[PDB]
Design an enzyme around this catalytic site. Structure first.
Site, PDB file in Angstrom:
ATOM      1  N   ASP B  90      -9.035   6.986  -1.509  1.00  0.00           N
ATOM      2  CA  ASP B  90      -8.864   6.566  -2.710  1.00  0.00           C
ATOM      3  C   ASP B  90      -9.541   7.520  -3.865  1.00  0.00           C
ATOM      4  O   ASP B  90      -8.449   7.884  -4.800  1.00  0.00           O
ATOM      5  CB  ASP B  90      -9.191   5.097  -3.157  1.00  0.00           C
ATOM      6  CG  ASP B  90      -8.411   3.946  -2.443  1.00  0.00           C
ATOM      7  OD1 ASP B  90      -7.351   4.172  -2.260  1.00  0.00           O
ATOM      8  OD2 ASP B  90      -8.843   2.741  -2.566  1.00  0.00           O
ATOM      9  N   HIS B 124      -9.221   0.790  -7.548  1.00  0.00           N
ATOM     10  CA  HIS B 124      -9.214   0.703  -6.066  1.00  0.00           C
ATOM     11  C   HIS B 124     -10.510   1.044  -5.371  1.00  0.00           C
ATOM     12  O   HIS B 124     -11.186   0.152  -4.814  1.00  0.00           O
ATOM     13  CB  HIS B 124      -8.035   1.085  -5.249  1.00  0.00           C
ATOM     14  CG  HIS B 124      -6.706   0.794  -5.886  1.00  0.00           C
ATOM     15  ND1 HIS B 124      -5.620   1.268  -5.444  1.00  0.00           N
ATOM     16  CD2 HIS B 124      -6.322  -0.076  -6.811  1.00  0.00           C
ATOM     17  CE1 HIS B 124      -4.569   1.027  -6.143  1.00  0.00           C
ATOM     18  NE2 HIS B 124      -5.268   0.083  -6.898  1.00  0.00           N
ATOM     19  N   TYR B 128     -14.124  -1.602  -3.807  1.00  0.00           N
ATOM     20  CA  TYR B 128     -15.114  -1.578  -2.779  1.00  0.00           C
ATOM     21  C   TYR B 128     -16.696  -1.448  -2.854  1.00  0.00           C
ATOM     22  O   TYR B 128     -17.536  -2.489  -2.261  1.00  0.00           O
ATOM     23  CB  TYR B 128     -14.805  -0.287  -1.781  1.00  0.00           C
ATOM     24  CG  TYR B 128     -13.272  -0.274  -1.263  1.00  0.00           C
ATOM     25  CD1 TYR B 128     -12.792  -1.398  -0.607  1.00  0.00           C
ATOM     26  CD2 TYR B 128     -12.237   0.654  -1.657  1.00  0.00           C
ATOM     27  CE1 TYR B 128     -11.685  -1.580  -0.006  1.00  0.00           C
ATOM     28  CE2 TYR B 128     -10.929   0.565  -1.285  1.00  0.00           C
ATOM     29  CZ  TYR B 128     -10.872  -0.700  -0.463  1.00  0.00           C
ATOM     30  OH  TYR B 128      -9.416  -0.699   0.060  1.00  0.00           O
ATOM     31  N   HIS B 218       3.112   2.489  -6.026  1.00  0.00           N
ATOM     32  CA  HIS B 218       2.832   3.973  -5.870  1.00  0.00           C
ATOM     33  C   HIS B 218       3.771   4.411  -4.907  1.00  0.00           C
ATOM     34  O   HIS B 218       4.477   5.369  -5.164  1.00  0.00           O
ATOM     35  CB  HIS B 218       1.326   4.076  -5.723  1.00  0.00           C
ATOM     36  CG  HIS B 218       0.442   3.542  -6.543  1.00  0.00           C
ATOM     37  ND1 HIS B 218      -0.743   3.670  -6.478  1.00  0.00           N
ATOM     38  CD2 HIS B 218       0.640   3.122  -7.848  1.00  0.00           C
ATOM     39  CE1 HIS B 218      -1.535   3.051  -7.504  1.00  0.00           C
ATOM     40  NE2 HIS B 218      -0.463   2.891  -8.378  1.00  0.00           N
TER      41      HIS B 218
HETATM   42 CL    CL Z   1      -0.498   6.921  -5.751  1.00  0.00          CL
HETATM   43 CL    CL Z   2      -2.785   5.238  -3.295  1.00  0.00          CL
HETATM   44 CU   CU1 Z   3      -1.496   4.630  -5.133  1.00  0.00          CU
END
Ligand code: CL
Ligand code: CL
Ligand code: CU1
Ligand code: CL
Ligand code: CL
Ligand code: CU1
Lengths: 311, 311
Positions: B90, B124, B128, B218
Site C-alpha cells: 500500500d 489502507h 493496519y 482501482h
Molecule cells: Cl490503485
Molecule cells: Cl491498491
Molecule cells: Cu488501489
C-alpha cells in the site's frame, strides 16, 4: 568496545518505497510505521485534514439561485471567469504540485498527507463545477473556459510556479507548494466574500470557507516542512534561500496585481482585492518563518469582508 | 460552407496543466471541466470512491481483543507480519504507483481519480497501523517491520513493479498499477478471511472488506483505461502488449508463490492462499480484457472464505 552496535534498528538500514524508486536502490524498503511516529505534527495534520473531509454535494448551492438571479450578466460572467481561474490553479496544485512533494518528504506520514492534499485540492477544483452546474448556463461555463485559456496575465502565474515542481530543487518546489494555498487564490476568494458580506451567494461562500479550512492547513504544513529543511542549510545558503523566497513572492505579486487589475478594474474591486491578496502574502511569509514587510494600510480588509473570511 | 464555425473549441487548442508540466508547452492550460465530461465512467467512479470514503477509526477494532487473545503467539506473529507486508505494498502504491498514473491520464477527471486512489491507498496502509495499535504489543510491531525489511521473497514483488512506475512507458506503468490491487495483496487477504470464516477477528475483516471495496474499483478502473489505450495500437503492438501482460503476470505469480510458501507453509495455509491468489490473477486478466488460463482446480476457494470475500 563499550559502544559497539550488535543490533541495527530496521528503520536506519531501510528506505521508504519513494526513496527506493527515485533516489537509492541499495537498501530494502520499509512499510510505513504509524505506531512509531517521527513527527507528532504529521499525526495532528493527518487527523485534522481527514476529519475535515467534505464534498461540494454537502452544500445546497441551489439556495443561491435567488441572489444569483439578482446579479446582471456582467457580474455572473465575472464570477464564472474568476472561479474557472481558481479551478485552473487547483488543477495545477492537485495534478502536479502536491504529488511532486511526496518524494521530497522528511517523514513517512508526510508522503500520505501530500496524497490527501492532492485529492482534497481536486475536490476544491470539483466544487466550482458543482456551483456552475447549479447557477450557470452552458454558454457561461464554456465562455469562462475560453477566457481562461486566452488570458495571458492569468496563465503567467501557474507558468511561473510549475517549473519549480518539475525541477530537482526540493526547497524551491516546497516554497512554490506553500505559495499556491498561501497567496495565489486569495485575489479570487475576495469576490465571493465581497458579495456574501452583502447577503449575495451565501451558500457559495460556505464552499469557499470549506476550501480555505483545507488551504490554511496546506500553507501551514508546507511552511512547517520548509522551515525544518532550511534549518539544515549553512547560514550562507539559509540567507540565499530567504532572498529567493522574497524575490519569488515579489515576482508573483507583480503577476497577481496585473491579473487582478485586468479581472476587477471594470468592477472597482482591484484595489481592495490586491490589499486582501497582500494581507495573505504576509501570512504566507509568516508560515515560512519570516516577518511580513507589508504595511497596515496596503493590507487593509473591510470588517464585513474579514468577518466572511474568519467565520 | 453549410456549417459556419465562428470560433474553435477551447478544449482542442489547450492542454491540462499536467500535460503542460511534462509533455507539451505549445498551447495554454485549461481548467478541469466537470460540466462537460468526456467519459461518464469517470464521473461514476469519482462518485463511488468519494461516497465510499472511510477511516479505520470508524471500526471498533477493540471488540476483536477477546478473539485476538484466543490466537497463539505464532498466529498473532503471522497476522502482524502478513499485514505489515500488505502495508508495504500500500505504501508503494500510495507514494509511487497511483501518483505516477496522473500525468498519463486519458481524461481530466482521471487525473483527480488517481489522486483519490493515492490518498485512499494511504488510508489502507494507515488501517493496519490502527489494527496494530489496538491488538499488538510494541515488540510484535517492531519485529514485523524488521521481518519485512529482511524478507527477500517479500521485497522481490514491489522491486519487480516499481521500475514500470518510474520508466516512460505509460501502458506498462498502467499494467503494474492494475496488478497491485488486482493480484498482489490477495495472498495476504486470504488470512483475515480464513480467520473470520472460523469466527476470529470479525472487526478486522470489516476493515479488510472496506479496503477491498476500494481495491476492486482501482483494479477495474486501471484495467478499463489500459483497454481504451491499447485498443488504439496496431494489431502487432496489441500482440506485443498482451505478451508483456502474460509474461509479467507469470513472473509475479512465481514471486508470489515463493513468498506465500515462506509465509504460510508452517501453518498449512500456502496451497489454499495460492489458489485464492490465482483466482484473482484470473479476474485481473479479465479486467484487462484477456481470458484466464487458470484451471478450476488451481483457483478453488472454500465457500466460507468466498462468503467473507463477497460479503
Ligand atoms: Cl490503485
Ligand atoms: Cl491498491
Ligand atoms: Cu488501489
Ligand atoms: Cl492549494
Ligand atoms: Cl497544497
Ligand atoms: Cu492546498
Amino acid at each position: 568496545s563499550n559502544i559497539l552496535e550488535m543490533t541495527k534498528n530496521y528503520y536506519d538500514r531501510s528506505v521508504s518505497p519513494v526513496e527506493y524508486a527515485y533516489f537509492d536502490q541499495s537498501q530494502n524498503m520499509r512499510a510505513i510505521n504509524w505506531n512509531k511516529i517521527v513527527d507528532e505534527k504529521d499525526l495532528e495534520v493527518w487527523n485534522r485534514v481527514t476529519q475535515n473531509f467534505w464534498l461540494p454535494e454537502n452544500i445546497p448551492v441551489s439556495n443561491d439561485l435567488p441572489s444569483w438571479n439578482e446579479l446582471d450578466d456582467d457580474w455572473q460572467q465575472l464570477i464564472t471567469r474568476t472561479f474557472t481561474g481558481l479551478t485552473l490553479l487547483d488543477t495545477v496544485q492537485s495534478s502536479i504540485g502536491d504529488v511532486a512533494q511526496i518524494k521530497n518528504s522528511l517523514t513517512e506520514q508526510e508522503q500520505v498527507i501530500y496524497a490527501n492534499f492532492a485529492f482534497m485540492v481536486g475536490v476544491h477544483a470539483r466544487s466550482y463545477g458543482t456551483i456552475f452546474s447549479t447557477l450557470c448556463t452552458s454558454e457561461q461555463i464554456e465562455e469562462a473556459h475560453e477566457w481562461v485559456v486566452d488570458n495571458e496575465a492569468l496563465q503567467a502565474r501557474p507558468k511561473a510556479l510549475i517549473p519549480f515542481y518539475t525541477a530537482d530543487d526540493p526547497l524551491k518546489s516546497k516554497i512554490a507548494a506553500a505559495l499556491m494555498p498561501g497567496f495565489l487564490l486569495y485575489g479570487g476568494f475576495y469576490l465571493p466574500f465581497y458579495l456574501s458580506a452583502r447577503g449575495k451567494l451565501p451558500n457559495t461562500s460556505d464552499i469557499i470557507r470549506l476550501i480555505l479550512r483545507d488551504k490554511v492547513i496546506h500553507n501551514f504544513y508546507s511552511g512547517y516542512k520548509y522551515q525544518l529543511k532550511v534549518a539544515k542549510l549553512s547560514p550562507e545558503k539559509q540567507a540565499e534561500m530567504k532572498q529567493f523566497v522574497f524575490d519569488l513572492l515579489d515576482k508573483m505579486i507583480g503577476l497577481e496585481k496585473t491579473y487582478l487589475h485586468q479581472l476587477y478594474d471594470g468592477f472597482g474591486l482591484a484595489d481592495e482585492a490586491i490589499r486582501f491578496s497582500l494581507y495573505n502574502a504576509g501570512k504566507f511569509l509568516q508560515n515560512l518563518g519570516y516577518e511580513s514587510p507589508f504595511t497596515k494600510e496596503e493590507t487593509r480588509i473591510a470588517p464585513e469582508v474579514f468577518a466572511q473570511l474568519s467565520a
